[model samples]
Target: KCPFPSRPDNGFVNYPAKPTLYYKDKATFGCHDGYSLDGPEEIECTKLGNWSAMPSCKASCKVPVKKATVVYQGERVKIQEKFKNGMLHGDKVSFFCKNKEKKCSYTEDAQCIDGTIEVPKCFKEHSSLAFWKTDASDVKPC
Candidate 1:
């Protein structure tokens, strides 16, 4: 017999699939919707007395702020609509930042790791009265 698999947060494994797992037996894992899997699809009971490493769930990342523009899959998506649900684990999004010395813009990328997106310090949310100010994303990239 081998060690049984356990559940990860927001995830589940095929438990008690058999009363006792023997060598060459296979077990599976899955996570709930909107969460990504960080481990194997299936683990095999080895010739050794244990199963391979287990599975885990990583939650998607919701947009931390409103009123910003970003690059998603090479397209400029207005923030809210693209991230209505959240960014899946390991996905990347680029935010634009302004150049202090010139009328140009630059970009910094943040990744959706686990359940969080670390918003860049260079990103400043626009205000209601800033019609005259140009958005870093709206301006030409530097």
Candidate 2:
């Protein structure tokens, strides 16, 4: 007996021996907003029956609503992540020295791409292992 109700009437569907039969199936796809679908969204069950395509998604870095600040005596600062659709999609993160309170005088707000601020290099004082300390008050060996 045919296992499926739809095909109970016929014991077997006449399939060609020479050519492979690809059975049809349903596949639904969805992607997080701000992220675009990358590959063919819909795939077809080929005549020789196979899902023709596999879909994929990618993140498109859009200029995000971000804020940048500079700390005195501090060079490197972390650029915070912006979220869209509950996903932290980092498009553009920038910093500026416009806050006169911090003695920053270049621009109040500037896009990171504008080349307004210089990127800072992060460094630790001494020690080389994972559990090392920075030179805040004490001096360490080179």
Candidate 3:
């Protein structure tokens, strides 16, 4: 929606301004997964050539369970905010599984590396319910 009446350009009105295009006269913006936009819900230009107020998106980090805010059901669940300067540096990411059955705690210095053949999966061993990486290398067990 237009935050101001000025219509120099309305993003939604310009089809060519689609967010995917790199060098188009018109362009759009969107929030990443797990995040929500905070300013104008959507922006578009008016026929009069006015643009709407730029919007801002923020991550709404959610806690799925009572104990943690995120979960890892696969081999290498990234610690959010890991990508810095085109690499995983100074990332505060964490991984975890069912109580004490080989779990990881939040870490600020953990550097995630490529894992084995596939993403880790949950397994049933003995009489306990647990999830483990297919290979030991798949995990930075803490």
Number of the predicted model whose lDDT against the real structure is largest: 1
Per-residue lDDT of candidate 2, residues 36-108 (tens digit) = 4444654445555455555554454433324223322244342332323222222233234222354323322
- In the range 64-119, model 1's lDDT, one tens digit per residue, is 88777888888888778887887899989989999878878988999999988898
The residue pairs in collision within model 1 are: none
What's the CA error at residue 35 for candidate 1, in Å? 2.1
The worst-scoring run of ten residues by lDDT in candidate 3 lies at 110-119
- In order, what lDDT does every prediction score? 0.83, 0.34, 0.33
Off by over 4 Å in 2: 1-22, 62-142
Q: Give the Å error, residue 48, model 1.
A: 2.6
Error of 2 at 102 (Å): 38
| Segments of candidate 3 deviating more than 4 angstroms | 1-28, 46-50, 62-142
Superior candidate under lDDT, 1 versus 3: 1
RMSD of each: 1.7, 16.2, 13.4
lDDT of 2: 0.34
The segments of candidate 1 whose C-alpha lies over 4 angstroms from its true place after superposition are none
Model 3: per-residue Cα lDDT over 12-123, one tens digit each: 2223533343221343455554444445654555555556456544443322212222233332443222222122112233334332455533222222221111112332
**Arrange candidates by TM-score, highest first: which order?**
1, 2, 3
